[PDB]
Design a protein around this ligand. Structure first.
Ligand SMILES: [Zn+2]
Ligand SMILES: [Zn+2]
Ligand SMILES: [Zn+2]
Ligand SMILES: [Zn+2]
Lengths: 135, 132
C-alpha cells in the first residue's frame, strides 16, 4: 500500500522532513488544498517551512506526476493525491474549498445521453459550484 | 442590437473588416474555432488577415460579447453568449459540438449539491464522445 512520500522517492525526488510534512498534509486532506492552505497547515507543524518550499514541493510533485492540479473557476488552484478512483467536484464558492462526489446516478445518465445523440462516452468534465444553504 | 453595435458601445474601434468577423461570428450557431472564423471571414472579404481576426476575437471576449470554451480535445471554440444556458458534448473525431440541456441532469445536480449542504448556483458539464 503506497503512501505519497513513498510514491515520491519512487520517481527520484529529493525528500526532506519539510517535504514529508507537506506530503502527509496533502495526503490527509480531502478538501483539495491550494498552495496557501498547505502552507498554513504545514507551518502550523514545522515553523521553519516557507511558502517558497511549499510551492517548489508542489510543482516538483506535479513534475513527478504524483499529484493532480485542478483549476476550478472559484478562485484557487487545487491539488490532490492522484485519486485511485474517478470522482467529480463540487466547489464551495464562499470558502473555495472542494467536495468530491461520485453519483453513479449521474454517470449512467451521462452515459445514456452520449447514446441519445449517437455516442460512446469517453470522458467528461463535471464541476458544480454551490453556496452554503441557510439552515 | 447587433454584435458590432454592441462592440461600438463598449468603445471598441470597428472597421469594415472587424464588422465581417462580427457578423460571421453572430450568424454561426455551430461552435466555431478561430480558424473556422478566419476561413469564413476571407471568403466574404479576402483582405481579412489572421492578425485582424485574432485581435478582434480577443476584444469581443474582453467586451463580454462572446464566450470562449477551451474543450479537452484541444480546440478553443466561440459563441455569442447565447442567451440560453446549455451544456456540451464534443465529437472527438470531427470536432462537432452538440449542445444539450437535460433537466433531469440539471435537477440531479441540485440534489447532489443540497445533500452536501449547498444550493447550486453554477456548473460546467462537458461530454466527450466517439460515434457509437
Ligand atoms: Zn464523473
Ligand atoms: Zn478531486
Ligand atoms: Zn455553447
Ligand atoms: Zn447544464
Amino acid at each position: 500500500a503506497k503512501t505519497l512520500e513513498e510514491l515520491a522517492t519512487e520517481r527520484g525526488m529529493r525528500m526532506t522532513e519539510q517535504r514529508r510534512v507537506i506530503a502527509r498534509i496533502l495526503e490527509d486532506s480531502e478538501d483539495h488544498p491550494d498552495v496557501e492552505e498547505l502552507y498554513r497547515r504545514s507551518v502550523k507543524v514545522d515553523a521553519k517551512i516557507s511558502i517558497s518550499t511549499v510551492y517548489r514541493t508542489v510543482k516538483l510533485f506535479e513534475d513527478a506526476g504524483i499529484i493532480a492540479r485542478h483549476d476550478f473557476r472559484d478562485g484557487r488552484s487545487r491539488y490532490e493525491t492522484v485519486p485511485e478512483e474517478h470522482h467529480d467536484h463540487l466547489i464551495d464558492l464562499k470558502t473555495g474549498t472542494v467536495i468530491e462526489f461520485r453519483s453513479p446516478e449521474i454517470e449512467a445518465l451521462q452515459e445514456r445521453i452520449a447514446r441519445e445523440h449517437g455516442f460512446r462516452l469517453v470522458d467528461h468534465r463535471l464541476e458544480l459550484y454551490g453556496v452554503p444553504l441557510k439552515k
